[PDB]
Amino acid sequence: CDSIVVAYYFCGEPIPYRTLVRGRAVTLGQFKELLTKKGSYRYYFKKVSDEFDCGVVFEEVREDEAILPVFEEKIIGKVEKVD
Amino acid sequence: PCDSIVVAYYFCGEPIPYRTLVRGRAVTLGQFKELLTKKGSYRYYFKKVSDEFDCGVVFEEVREDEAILPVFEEKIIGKVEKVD
Amino acid sequence: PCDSIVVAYYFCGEPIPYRTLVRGRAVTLGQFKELLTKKGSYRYYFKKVSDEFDCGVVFEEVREDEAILPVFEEKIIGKVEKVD
Ligand SMILES: [Hg+2]
Ligand SMILES: [Hg+2]
Ligand SMILES: [Hg+2]
Ligand SMILES: [Hg+2]
Ligand SMILES: [Hg+2]
Ligand SMILES: [Hg+2]
Ligand SMILES: [Hg+2]
Ligand SMILES: [Hg+2]
Ligand SMILES: [Hg+2]
Structure with missing residues (x-):
């Protein structure tokens, strides 16, 4: 295993990008x-x-250097535009 | 598989830069x-x-600090100066 | 729109000027x-x-420093010398 799954929901959209x-x-x-x-x-x-x-x-x-948490083996992010 | 960048800076004149x-x-x-x-x-x-x-x-x-640092010959060479 | 000016100076002889x-x-x-x-x-x-x-x-x-620095070919090119 030389990889991680990174999905994020973007600025509200229902289908996350994987x-x-x-x-x-x-x-x-x-x-x-x-x-x-x-x-x-x-x-x-x-x-x-x-x-x-x-x-x-x-x-x-x-912080950019920060390591993102892993939820059930994947990285699930929410990206929100400010304002 | 290239996946990371070298960042070295000279810190307040101390010759040996930190890598x-x-x-x-x-x-x-x-x-x-x-x-x-x-x-x-x-x-x-x-x-x-x-x-x-x-x-x-x-x-x-x-x-700025959302600013993207320039790359010199593939590396990032910084000079950090304390404001005296 | 323009907005800014480039200010570079050579510092105490150091070849590479700071921009x-x-x-x-x-x-x-x-x-x-x-x-x-x-x-x-x-x-x-x-x-x-x-x-x-x-x-x-x-x-x-x-x-003076109330004085306006000259512009050479659109930029400000300064020499800074420590009084030794
Ligand atoms: Hg994997
Ligand atoms: Hg957006
Ligand atoms: Hg609950
Ligand atoms: Hg690399
Ligand atoms: Hg310092
Ligand atoms: Hg300009
Ligand atoms: Hg100096
Ligand atoms: Hg020289
Ligand atoms: Hg000459």
Whole structure:
């Protein structure tokens, strides 16, 4: 296994965009390179959270060097345009 | 399978530059800024060819941080200066 | 729309000049002085057209800083020398 599945829902759209990334670990900045549209966005990723009752959160990630959480083996991101 | 970039910067004149690899194709000032360990006010320059003259490439000052750093001969060569 | 000016200076003899863009139409010595990172006593010169001979052009010494820096072929080319 030399890869990870990276899917994100984009600016509201219902069908998420899916791609494979070589590495087993992905950073925000790598994820940012898959995006095609310029502008200001916030990025969230499903992550398990003991501290929440329905198990899941969308963790906001901000720093490029940061390693994105993995939910059930995949990276599930939400990309939201600001404003 | 090329998947990451070399980022070296000279830090306040200390000759020996600090070297690291960054995953991805291109790097922004803000990502570069996350590799730095010391707090404070700094300016940042990066080698990158100019179309002026002798012994000449430039050190381009970058400040935005969603700005994509120039690449000199395939690497990112930065100069980090503390504002005195 | 234009918006900015290119400001490059050679610093203490270092060959590779440092390059930045400055917002606005024209730049003053005092604005130029704010780009500099190192403290101390310096003199500042800028290429500019001249009406004297051999190699055609001069380095005008500027000191006021309310003064507007000359523009050589659309850019500001400065020489910064530490007073030794
Ligand atoms: Hg796999
Ligand atoms: Hg969008
Ligand atoms: Hg719940
Ligand atoms: Hg590489
Ligand atoms: Hg320093
Ligand atoms: Hg030389
Ligand atoms: Hg311009
Ligand atoms: Hg100097
Ligand atoms: Hg000559």
